Design a binder for this molecule. Structure first.
Ligand code: NAD
Ligand code: NAD
Ligand code: UPG
Ligand code: UPG
Lengths: 340, 340
């Protein structure tokens, strides 16, 4: 039994109050589903900028009526200090996921990304701190590694940001560290590495590669590969990311004011992904015979990204049990039902 | 003749349009005085948050009526993108000084500091970029060195921030670098090291050590030393900082998208400063016989700060001609006239 498995068993016995910002988004709604199923009490904050009411509706259809009543939802904005203080009222653990992802988005509109990702992040720290919360866990990013080529990726060795988005995610780490030095408010930042799974928005022009591609194959549209397709990623199935969050939310002091890489330590080239998704969809009765259409590399894009999760395994007892294949197998059916 | 001296002679012959944000503040009004005297055209942006109309009035009394008419003032906020675009209209060189200094201030109120220092800074980059400006120079800070003990300070070796303020100043560098990578908008950031001189506000609870102490001695109040007084600084007289600004605003491409240390490479302990100011005031007919009152170190304060200006001397031809003594001698008379 891993530390998470035992935690899964302990939580329902000693229920706590959790706060999930960006609860209507991909990662947020998944965290919600898991916590409500662990009979925890959850408060959610979201403004629907990129999240959806359907994500909340889907969760309700997946959890028991009782567990769903343990959920309090607040339609607010983390850029509004009032909404933050409100969402942190009497909360035990904060899981901050509210943000505006997508490098391309931040590049053609750095101001809008800055407002939520940095101002909003800072408001949450103050509100969480002032609410005397027990723990604060926030979504960081592997983009912080920037240009630095070296592999695997180690937490202490980072490169220079390659985009506005990357800057904001790195600033979340900076402010987190300072709040620890100046107020003794320790946090735990999780550097996610390409998370995927159910409820990750396939629509919009900034959709992630997996949702975008899976959606396109089901619809029979062309699939675009930015570059030669040799670009590699450490795709982390949602379930592994959920584990890290709960783990960080309840870690010992020795593990606080620390940032961790959250992935599986695997390497998947975009070319492998194309076939993984296509074959995965084929097992579900979806035929796709189109070849991938290769176009130019995308700006502010990283070449390779492999994570060393030994720090997370060692200090948090993080033990991911889902490789890309398992995740893809679990995800594909969902998208087919979503697009039907 | 230094590169600045020749630049002093060249500018009046080929006048350019300059933009100074925070033009009503200490460093900003001094830059204004110098530029107007070099017969340059200047646009100023300020909201008087910490600046003063008197600083502008003093400048008017110091420059010719003709040179003063070459000045356009805009009462605006860099947090307002409209005001930024307005201030950058048809501008050649941008000297961004608008910000909210003071570590103590950012510590007891990180949100207010974040808004101006990061959001406002980002708006200026966009507006300067969209206005097709020829150069963008911004006020950085030696605080970016943070904890790192090593001396002298070298631009490539920085430590971890010790306060919210330090974070914002470091983020100005981050966004500046990214704007160079993504838009080809190169900038030059100047890491100032404790600037002082005429018009540096002696009032308020966040006043810098020199203005605060000088003011207190003239008034006959007690002088407080936070710590043992062995805390050392590289006090940089305003005139040296002005040189760096104009130098950076007109530097060759090889010098762009680069950050520089701006000081004199000198080391002055707070204990030496106490006597430098007191003796300096004594030469002007001001008697002070009180001994300094030592109290606890101030939070988010750096122990020692010495700068290696060789990078600035080498790439910008920076050649400061004012040590603390000269600066103090020039400053003291001003404060005596200000408090009278
Ligand atoms: N998905 C990945 O692979 C990945 C990788 C690295 C980091 N992250 C981070 O994980 C977090 C969640 O990502 P996600 O993929 O679930 O995206 P998502 O867009 O599905 O979730 C983000 C949610 O935050 C909400 N939000 C945005 N701005 C808000 C504001 N100002 N006030 C209130 N709510 C606001 C949105 O409505 C949305 O529901 C983000 O912070 C992101 O930066 C994700
Ligand atoms: N003085 C030093 O020793 C020192 C050291 C390192 C960095 N700096 C930097 O130099 C710059 C100028 O410092 P200064 O000592 O002349 O301070 P100052 O307070 O005298 O000047 C700052 C000016 O900016 C204006 N301002 C602030 N927020 C604004 C906003 N949101 N919109 C428009 N105007 C705004 C203020 O009204 C003020 O006049 C600052 O950016 C500071 O961070 C100064
Ligand atoms: O239609 C498409 C979409 C994407 N890609 C490529 O696939 C790779 C991955 O795309 P993406 O899912 O956007 O990954 P990232 O650029 O690593 O961004 C991920 O990681 C970022 C920082 O960690 C987060 O902000 C994003 O939410 C998350 O998608 C990139 O090389 C893209 O160029 C394609 O080839 N074709
Ligand atoms: O009444 C006083 C005021 C200050 N100090 C000390 O004197 C030193 C210098 O004070 P200060 O002038 O506030 O210097 P910094 O803390 O280095 O801040 C300077 O450098 C910062 C970052 O570079 C800028 O934000 C500020 O505007 C600028 O004052 C510090 O150790 C203070 O503790 C005293 O002992 N007594």
């Amino acid at each position: 039994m891993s530390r998470y498995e035992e935690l899964r068993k302990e939580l329902p016995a000693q229920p706590k109050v959790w706060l999930i910002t960006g609860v209507a988004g991909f990662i947020g709604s998944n965290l919600l589903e898991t916590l409500l199923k662990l009979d925890q009490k959850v408060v959610g904050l979201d403004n629907f900028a990129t999240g959806h009411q359907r994500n909340l509706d889907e969760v309700r259809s997946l959890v028991s009526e009782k567990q769903w009543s343990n959920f309090k939802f607040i339609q607010g904005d983390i850029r509004n200090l009032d909404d933050c203080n409100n969402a942190c009222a009497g909360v035990d653990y904060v899981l901050h996921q509210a943000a505006l992802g997508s490098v391309p988005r931040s590049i053609n509109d750095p101001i809008t990304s800055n407002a939520t990702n940095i101002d909003g992040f800072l408001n949450m720290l103050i509100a969480a701190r002032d609410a005397k919360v027990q723990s604060f866990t926030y979504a960081a990013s592997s983009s912080t590694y920037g240009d630095h080529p070296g592999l695997p990726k180690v937490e202490d060795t980072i490169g220079k940001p390659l985009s506005p988005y990357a800057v904001t995610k790195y600033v979340n780490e900076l402010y987190a560290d300072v709040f620890s030095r100046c107020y003794g408010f320790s946090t735990i930042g999780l550097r996610y590495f390409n998370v995927f799974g159910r409820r990750q928005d396939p629509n919009g022009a900034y959709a992630a590669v997996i949702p975008k591609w899976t959606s396109s194959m089901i619809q029979g549209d062309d699939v675009y590969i930015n570059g030669d397709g040799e670009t590699s990623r450490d795709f982390c199935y949602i379930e592994n990311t959920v584990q890290a969050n709960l783990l960080a939310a309840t870690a010992g002091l020795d593990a606080r004011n620390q940032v961790y890489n959250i992935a599986v330590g695997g390497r998947t080239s975009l070319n492998q992904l194309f076939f993984a998704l296509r074959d995965g969809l084929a097992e579900n009765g979806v035929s796709y015979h189109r070849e991938p259409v290769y176009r130019d590399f995308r700006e502010g894009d990283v070449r390779h990204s492999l994570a060393d999760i030994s720090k997370a395994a060692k200090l948090l007892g993080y033990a991911p049990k889902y490789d890309v294949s398992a995740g893809v197998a679990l995800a594909m059916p969902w998208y087919i039902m979503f697009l039907k």
